Amino acid sequence: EVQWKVVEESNNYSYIDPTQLPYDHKWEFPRNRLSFGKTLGAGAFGKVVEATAQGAMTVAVKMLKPSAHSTEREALMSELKVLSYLGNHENIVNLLGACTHGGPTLVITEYCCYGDLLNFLRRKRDEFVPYKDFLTLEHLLSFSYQVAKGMAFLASKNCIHRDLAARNILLTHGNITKICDFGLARDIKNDSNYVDKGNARLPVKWMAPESIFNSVYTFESDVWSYGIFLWELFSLGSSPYPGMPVDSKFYKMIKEGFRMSSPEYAPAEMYDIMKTCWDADPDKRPTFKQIVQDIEKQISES
Numbered sequence: 001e002v003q004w005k006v007v008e009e010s011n012n013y014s015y016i017d018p019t020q021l022p023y024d025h026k027w028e029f030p031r032n033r034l035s036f037g038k039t040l041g042a043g044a045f046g047k048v049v050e051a052t053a054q055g056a057m058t059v060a061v062k063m064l065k066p067s068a069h070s071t072e073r074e075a076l077m078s079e080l081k082v083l084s085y086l087g088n089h090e091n092i093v094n095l096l097g098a099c100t101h102g103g104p105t106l107v108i109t110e111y112c113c114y115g116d117l118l119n120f121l122r123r124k125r126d127e128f129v130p131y132k133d134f135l136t137l138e139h140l141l142s143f144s145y146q147v148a149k150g151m152a153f154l155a156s157k158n159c160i161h162r163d164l165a166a167r168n169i170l171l172t173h174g175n176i177t178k179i180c181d182f183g184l185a186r187d188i189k190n191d192s193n194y195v196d197k198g199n200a201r202l203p204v205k206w207m208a209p210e211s212i213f214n215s216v217y218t219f220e221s222d223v224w225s226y227g228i229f230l231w232e233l234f235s236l237g238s239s240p241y242p243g244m245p246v247d248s249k250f251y252k253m254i255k256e257g258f259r260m261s262s263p264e265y266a267p268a269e270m271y272d273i274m275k276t277c278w279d280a281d282p283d284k285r286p287t288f289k290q291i292v293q294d295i296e297k298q299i300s301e302s
């Protein structure tokens, strides 16, 4: 299941069972104060809908479809539990409330009015200018910085995203980016950026080699995916390894050290970050804390 995980020291780390996390009923919000509007996204067993919450503000509500298995209802509760455990950060999509009694489970989160960053980059591409409502290099550096800060936050809570990519970054007012976990509000069997692997469907072009070939997911594999995200960002939304099918040839190239070339709009210091994120040795990749400091220096030099 493609979703984030909280880990605990064991093994090195093992996933926690999120059903065992506590749920504080302080999050409880009266269901009668929600007015539901348009659907923003929909998986096979769930969906996220724009809503108005009186006591008015626009929010996003995650909920199950009526055909949901009993393990899906628990899964949505576990989503709520993980969000409550993580706490609040500017660069994640934050929990605002929940409805857990008197009806089906509703998870109320922040609404990001511009949608996912990938599609935003793609429709802004032909107006982009490196320097001077155009998208500029200043914005891209800001987005890189914010996603690094959000990931540093998740890592500090022992959380591994496992699917970091521009499609999972949302954009809201003030050019603020927020990391998201679609969970039951997305069906990946649709999306060609996921690839069949055994029983699983996986975002192979974003994954570290040790995740693909050894099923190892760590703080360090998230850094690999962040490097792929940077490439998406400074390519203005191009698909990674463009024109290369995922087959045995692709896997061999990754294993033997093949990497993407620099996007034409990436500053050399940002391509330097990408390259270190894609070190075959996870111990040689930077931490998100290091990445934050490096990008802070570039913005200062800007």
Ligand SMILES: CCN(CC)CCNC(=O)c1c(C)[nH]c(/C=C2\C(=O)Nc3ccc(F)cc32)c1C
Residues within 6 Å of the ligand: 040, 041, 048, 060, 062, 093, 109, 110, 111, 112, 113, 114, 115, 116, 119, 170, 180, 181, 182, 183, 185
């Ligand atoms: C296909 C691109 N289209 C624009 C050109 C669609 C635009 N994209 C949109 O409208 C959109 C908006 C405005 N919000 C979301 C998603 C979420 C949001 O806001 N909070 C969440 C919390 C959890 C979650 F799992 C998803 C969301 C979308 C897809």
Ligand SMILES: [Cl-]
Residues within 6 Å of the ligand: 146
């Ligand atoms: Cl910021």
